[PDB]
Design a protein around this ligand. Sequence first.
Ligand SMILES: CCCCCC/C=C/CCCCCCCCCC(=O)O[C@H](COC(=O)CCCCCCCCCCCCCCC)COP(=O)(O)OC[C@@H](O)CO
Ligand SMILES: CCCCCC/C=C/CCCCCCCCCC(=O)O[C@H](COC(=O)CCCCCCCCCCCCCCC)COP(=O)(O)OC[C@@H](O)CO
Ligand SMILES: CCCCCC/C=C\CCCCCCCCCC(=O)O[C@H](COC(=O)CCCCCCCCCCCCCCC)COP(=O)(O)OC[C@@H](O)CO
Ligand SMILES: CCCCCC/C=C\CCCCCCCCCC(=O)O[C@H](COC(=O)CCCCCCCCCCCCCCC)COP(=O)(O)OC[C@@H](O)CO
Ligand SMILES: CCCCCC/C=C\CCCCCCCCCC(=O)O[C@H](COC(=O)CCCCCCCCCCCCCCC)COP(=O)(O)OC[C@@H](O)CO
Ligand SMILES: CCCCCC/C=C\CCCCCCCCCC(=O)O[C@H](COC(=O)CCCCCCCCCCCCCCC)COP(=O)(O)OC[C@@H](O)CO
Lengths: 256, 256, 263, 263, 95
Amino acid sequence: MNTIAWLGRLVIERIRGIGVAALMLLQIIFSLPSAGGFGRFVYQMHRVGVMSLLIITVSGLFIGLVLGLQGYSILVNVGSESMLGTMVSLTLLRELAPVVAALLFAGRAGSALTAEIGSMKQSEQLASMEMIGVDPLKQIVSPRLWAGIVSLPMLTVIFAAIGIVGGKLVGVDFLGVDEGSFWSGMQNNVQFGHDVVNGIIKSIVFALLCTWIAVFQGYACDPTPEGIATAMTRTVVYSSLCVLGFDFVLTAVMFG
Amino acid sequence: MNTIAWLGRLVIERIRGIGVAALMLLQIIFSLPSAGGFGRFVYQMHRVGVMSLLIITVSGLFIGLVLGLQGYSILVNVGSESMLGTMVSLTLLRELAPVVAALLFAGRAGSALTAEIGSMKQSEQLASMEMIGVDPLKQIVSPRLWAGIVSLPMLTVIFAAIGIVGGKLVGVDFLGVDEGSFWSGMQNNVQFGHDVVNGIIKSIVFALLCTWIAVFQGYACDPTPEGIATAMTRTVVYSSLCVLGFDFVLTAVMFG
Amino acid sequence: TQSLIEVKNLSFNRGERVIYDNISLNIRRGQITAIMGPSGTGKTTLLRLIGGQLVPDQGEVLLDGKDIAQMSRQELFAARARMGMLFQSGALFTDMSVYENVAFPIRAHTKLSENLIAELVALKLESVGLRGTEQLMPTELSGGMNRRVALARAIALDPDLIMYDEPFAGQDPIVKGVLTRLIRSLREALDLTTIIVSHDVPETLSIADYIYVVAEGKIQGEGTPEELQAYASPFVKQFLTGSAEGPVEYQFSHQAYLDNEVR
Amino acid sequence: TQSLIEVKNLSFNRGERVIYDNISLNIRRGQITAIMGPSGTGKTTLLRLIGGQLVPDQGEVLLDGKDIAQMSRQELFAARARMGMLFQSGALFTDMSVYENVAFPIRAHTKLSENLIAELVALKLESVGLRGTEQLMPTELSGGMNRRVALARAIALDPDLIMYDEPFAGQDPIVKGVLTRLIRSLREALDLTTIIVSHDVPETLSIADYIYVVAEGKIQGEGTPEELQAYASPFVKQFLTGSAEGPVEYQFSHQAYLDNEVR
Amino acid sequence: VVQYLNQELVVSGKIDFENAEQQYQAGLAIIKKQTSFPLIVDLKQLEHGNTLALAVLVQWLRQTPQKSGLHFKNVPEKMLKIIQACHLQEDLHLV
Ligand SMILES: CCCCCC/C=C/CCCCCCCCCC(=O)O[C@H](COC(=O)CCCCCCCCCCCCCCC)COP(=O)(O)OC[C@@H](O)CO
Ligand SMILES: CCCCCC/C=C/CCCCCCCCCC(=O)O[C@H](COC(=O)CCCCCCCCCCCCCCC)COP(=O)(O)OC[C@@H](O)CO
Ligand SMILES: CCCCCC/C=C\CCCCCCCCCC(=O)O[C@H](COC(=O)CCCCCCCCCCCCCCC)COP(=O)(O)OC[C@@H](O)CO
Ligand SMILES: CCCCCC/C=C\CCCCCCCCCC(=O)O[C@H](COC(=O)CCCCCCCCCCCCCCC)COP(=O)(O)OC[C@@H](O)CO
Ligand SMILES: CCCCCC/C=C\CCCCCCCCCC(=O)O[C@H](COC(=O)CCCCCCCCCCCCCCC)COP(=O)(O)OC[C@@H](O)CO
Ligand SMILES: CCCCCC/C=C\CCCCCCCCCC(=O)O[C@H](COC(=O)CCCCCCCCCCCCCCC)COP(=O)(O)OC[C@@H](O)CO
């Protein structure tokens, strides 16, 4: 039992890692605000939010193009091509725009947060800030956490808006369905509180998980040049399993 | 025009980067095999393929659980709950299993290939191997490229198989549809050559793009500890845009 | 022999690796104290215990009689206003330019006006020799000058203890020359008390006043650089000379090479 | 004065940074040749041009009359069997173990049996002093011993030219002592020709026989370590000693501090 | 305990960035109403001058007739060690 002991030692250190990351989160969100902390938050909205705007916009257009092309082939055989705008908008708003925009946020803006905090730990800027008398959990970590909780629900709304515009462009303007029936069938079956707000509630839960993992792995890193790179691929794996895992739980409550 | 000149200089170096990566690929696949090269390929099938087996298996089960739960709610209102196995298997086999398994391969096995090759470049093992008289494109790069082209189409077949098993588990065993009508409606509408083989042809195109990007960014890296980490987030962004971009082109040919 | 920092019987461990088994050190005021030793060990972990970032396991570090481990959040914040530390790479905060690097510890322990902060920064940067370089980033600073901006930040609050870890390393004799003129000049101008943790023997003995030599868990020798060599153990000799005779072994273990089957 | 490598009028550039403007070097056989200079430059890029990994821009490097740039794929592969190079970190192939690191250049230029390869590796590792350590990985090798496995790999084919870049750096005087005994001993036992690229002045002058000093684009001084100091330019002086008097400036540029408005 | 007028200003006490804002401001109000500026600052009664006592002295020199217009009396031997450490050994006027 040489590897069986190695396997059991592995999952104990991972259980203990969730305990450190839980106490690290309660120390950030339960503390008083300080001086100059809003301006550090607006700077990190540029690095997390605005830098992710180009991958999110082009990926939302490409997904709406496939939905309008595949959804026309199903509906035209049952005489319901007027329900194309209903199925395009309801597939994005409740399934695809919360989930796919959280898998591209964990790859771009999540893995770049655990490389920036991790190279501050290697070059000893976090130990130099602490010996001056400034907590690096408040100065460095806390603006980066709040900038990810705000930027991902702002980016799935832009994801869903171009997905519907991209699906209208292939459906109405190329395959030739009626434009007035596209929007009227959408305004009839899509509700705001049950379909649009329930997609924002999903992406706030995903933004908390994708950013708390990305911030923890850079802080509790191994300050060694291939200990940082091992941590960057842990935030892409752990965030993708948590996004797909919490997605089944949230649809069974909201739409079950 | 100070930033306009910076923007134009940016997209010229990216155009020139595709030219280096094209000539690098033609030098790998058009060369003779050598001694001891099969055993290096079986070692890299362990690092790329077997290490990715746990994220792929659990993510395929979670996605099939959502498909069987959402697809029951649509079909039960039109009296077609017997078509649940047809829509679960045809959503995975032609759309979701090639695409979502390529977004988790670019994050785990793609970003770990550009960190391993990039730290060989920083610690000067690639320059030390070249001055001995061994080409590092054949010794190091070429086993890693072929192990990714083989392992991703082997991993979307396992992705689609557990997605159907996961969708049968929520549909038949919890929501209570007939088991014999689940499999008989699936064996009637799903063809092998048009639906199963067309999903494998997609994942071979995606495995070439996801691995050629991951291998190039580690070889043409910047041997500096935050020049490696900048390269690891370039293989997740460039592979995700190429997977979603080539997915629209392949469905318009296969299913259009 | 009035001691500012005084260490008494501490023990540290990092992954079952022994660092500082049982060791007592006296850091006298107004004097350069060096701690030499072989590399690969945890030589810089004492400066992490003095400023207070790690906790010892069976020890107490005394700053003027007060222990640093048993010390609340408003005594530790006030103790760190008397200490500066220059790390080896000169740990400058990337995004911040040279002006708000030097003014970072000022704005943490002050409520000062903007016109007096800009006069402290201009006098600290010029006492190092870097007056004109205030508005440019830490990148493109010709990295032998990164360690001079980081010396102004480590001195801005006018402390009474400054800690250098490895200031003499793979550096030019020109760059190593500027630092040895600056370490001696800044501690007569400000009456400091320095601790240098290094292993550059020909440079350390010409700048220090009391050398400790720590091999694996304890002191192997101490004293003035004149009397350290005269009362030398048969470890301090090899270390301070680099000879073949001593306790460390040049061969791997012990064999005769005609005793193993090769293959 | 028979020269093995002979450099004639080359020029290199890396992002509009001048390295080797117009410089000619003679590497005589059977002698240690050192190339000292200030850091931050491209000092190690000459060894990348001798072995052949970069291409010069207006120059030709002559290996026994033959130019390395104008040289086909079967002359360059046969030229690299006469050269070894020990990098600064000792660039060992991770997953490989001490046995197949040393046997890597053997299996590239040979068709030898397994029982003679295992005798060459056991004699190369023992001539360095590492006989018992053959089956364990490069990780957990106590990194002053990583540079001794990498010296056995750099010497396995019994070359006639071996190149070290920065063997004297931030190392212990014990670890630096083993290498200085090994550099002198291995070149009388094998009749080598060494090139050392370093900036450790007190260690290099005691081991070299002809020093070149390259400041920004050209030689600032050359000769025996006795005659280099006696015919010294007013750059080799400051550099060789680290004094304040010379062309490099300790102040930033030039001011009087009562000429600028601060804020 | 900080400074009077006394027909040329006598800097007294100790400047340690907890009171070092009024001691700049109250000393500045003398410089506002001074005529012809030959006045000499009397650094007589300091005891802990350290790089901030100098930081308020240069701030008084910038608001003066010309760039100088200000002399200094005898220095408590700790402060002029920091004058030459900041290379101001020949930039001010010391009698
Ligand atoms: C037949 C009935 C038809 C439905 C009628 C509803 C009509 C539509 C109107 C409004 C939509 C209501 C639908 C339910 C809403 C789901 C609420 C929910 O899912 O709650 C979420 C819990 O998520 C998590 O923990 C993941 C944990 C999930 C388990 C939580 C269990 C929820 C139980 C209470 C919810 C009551 C449901 C009311 C609906 C009938 C919290 O979301 P946030 O506010 O963003 O908190 C931010 C987080 O970071 C927490 O700090
Ligand atoms: C009304 C008709 C109904 C359909 C009847 C078909 C019945 C089903 C039976 C069989 C399925 C045939 C469907 C078409 C198959 C698509 C072929 C394809 O898409 O070809 C792919 C091209 O992909 C790329 O370049 C991305 C480039 C894409 C552009 C390629 C354009 C294809 C044009 C030729 C294909 C003929 C289509 C025949 C179908 C009518 C190549 O795939 P691989 O072999 O993996 O090559 C590996 C790559 O790395 C190349 O090195
Ligand atoms: C239901 C109750 C509310 C829901 C939240 C529930 C979660 C639990 C409670 C959370 C709130 C508790 C209040 C305490 C917050 C603690 C975090 C904090 O206080 O962080 C602060 C940052 O400012 C900051 O609020 C970051 C600045 C503001 C961030 C948010 C900005 C809001 C703007 C978008 C709001 C969306 C509304 C739009 C609707 C369409 C302080 O950080 P620093 O200044 O950099 O520290 C540095 C120094 O200490 C040392 O250098
Ligand atoms: C009703 C429906 C609702 C929908 C609403 C509309 C949706 C949004 C619309 C449009 C959004 C466009 C996205 C804009 C992206 C802005 C990115 C940005 O603005 O980031 C800039 C860089 O972007 C950069 O890399 C340059 C980034 C790469 C440049 C792109 C190059 C690819 C394009 C060229 C090829 C043409 C495409 C081929 C077509 C055939 C910032 O520069 P930095 O130096 O990094 O930071 C500087 C800071 O330190 C201080 O300033
Ligand atoms: C339509 C035509 C075929 C489709 C391909 C089209 C693409 C273009 C042509 C490709 C084939 C050209 C043949 C040349 C291949 C060049 C690559 C190569 O030759 O790589 C070799 C690796 O072996 C190797 O084939 C890697 C060893 C084998 C890899 C593949 C293993 C196949 C097993 C799975 C096959 C799936 C079949 C299952 C069906 C259900 C050599 O590498 P090294 O030995 O490490 O070098 C090291 C030394 O030089 C110095 O140290
Ligand atoms: C008909 C339908 C068709 C379907 C077919 C069936 C589908 C496949 C079925 C099952 C696939 C299971 C996946 C097995 C994963 C194998 C991974 C593996 O085997 O990798 C190992 C490590 O895995 C490791 O990290 C250990 C990895 C993490 C351990 C997992 C810990 C999480 C589980 C504990 C928590 C319980 C779950 C909670 C439930 C309530 C290898 O060890 P290494 O040291 O890294 O390498 C060693 C090498 O140098 C030489 O050996």
